[PDB]
Paper text:
We finally extended the phases to 1.65 Å resolution using a native data set and refined a high-resolution structure for this variant. The PpsRQ-[name] structure revealed a typical [name] fold consisting of a five-stranded antiparallel β-sheet flanked by several helices. In addition to the [name] core, part of the Q-­linker adopts an α-helical conformation corresponding to a [name] N-cap. This is important for dimer formation as observed for other N-cap-containing [name] domains. The main dimerization interface is formed by the N-cap, its connecting loop to the [name] core (residues 156–161) and β51. The N-cap further contributes to PpsRQ-[name] dimer formation by protecting hydrophobic patches on the [name] core of the symmetry-related molecule, as also reported for a subset of other [name] proteins. The 20 N-­terminal residues are disordered and could not be modelled into the electron-density map. The remaining ordered part of the Q-linker region (residues 143–157) forms a helical element that corresponds to a classical [name] N-cap. As proposed previously, the N-domain also significantly contributes to [name] oligomer formation and/or integrity, most likely by stabilizing the extended Q-linker helix as shown by the disordered N-terminal Q-linker part of the PpsRQ-[name] structure. In contrast to the other studied [name] variants, PpsRQ-[name] exists predominantly as a monomer at the concentrations used in this experiment.
The redox-responding transcription factor [name] (photopigment suppression) from [name] is such a multi-[name] domain-containing protein. [name] possesses three [name] domains (designated N-domain, [name] and PAS2) and a highly conserved glutamine-rich linker (Q-linker) as well as a C-terminal helix–turn–helix (HTH) DNA-binding motif. [name] acts as a repressor of photosynthesis and tetrapyrrole-biosynthesis gene expression by binding to palindromic DNA sequences (TGTc-N10-gACA) present in the promoter region of [name]-regulated genes. Additionally, the function of [name] is regulated in a blue-light- and oxygen-dependent manner by the antirepressor AppA that, together with [name] and its cognate DNA, is able to form a light-sensitive ternary AppA–PpsR2–DNA complex.
Residue numbers in the entry:
A (entry chain A), B (entry chain A): 143 to 257
Write the structure that this text describes.
Amino acid sequence: TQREMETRYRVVLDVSRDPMVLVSMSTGRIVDLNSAAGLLLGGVRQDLLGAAIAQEFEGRRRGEFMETMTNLAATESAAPVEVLARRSQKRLLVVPRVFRAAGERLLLCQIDPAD
Amino acid sequence: TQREMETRYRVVLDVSRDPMVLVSMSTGRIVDLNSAAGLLLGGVRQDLLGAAIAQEFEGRRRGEFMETMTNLAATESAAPVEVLARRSQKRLLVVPRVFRAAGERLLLCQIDPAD
């Protein structure tokens, strides 16, 4: 059940063509992502896991960026933040949604190209 | 951990814009899906959960259809089956991938419009 649902989660995230990054509300760090997100961000999973999400985006810092996404996720309008990914040099639209798991909050962020 | 990973799975599947249906290899029935899949199939989650996947598609039967998807998933080429969804009357492309969880196999099927 632990491993069962873990396995379902892993496969659905990996197979999904929707570019997604999962971010810790506590630390602002990337806790998971899929390869579609990796492609838009310009990095492999191994480089992005554990990385501060704000530092992937030019001119952003953890405090303000996490506050921005937290506030946007509260509008429940799928409102996006416009960003520029340092590695890929692609302008992107990031749409955050907050949910609770294991006593903490995570932000599931969808990524789309902006241009 | 059971609930934690279950919660992650639920949210990722629901939020993902990639239309996905999860099918039991054992029964050929739909065990899960997201609303993007529901839209293409022409049914709500409540009508589709527990339904035989083959019976959603005109002219298909469980035996041959499950054998078709199982064989296609083995080619590892993302080869699609062309189908016509009874409820929505949309021609679709279904791409199956097989994985193991909790001692059984599931097919995670991506759905795309065909026309």
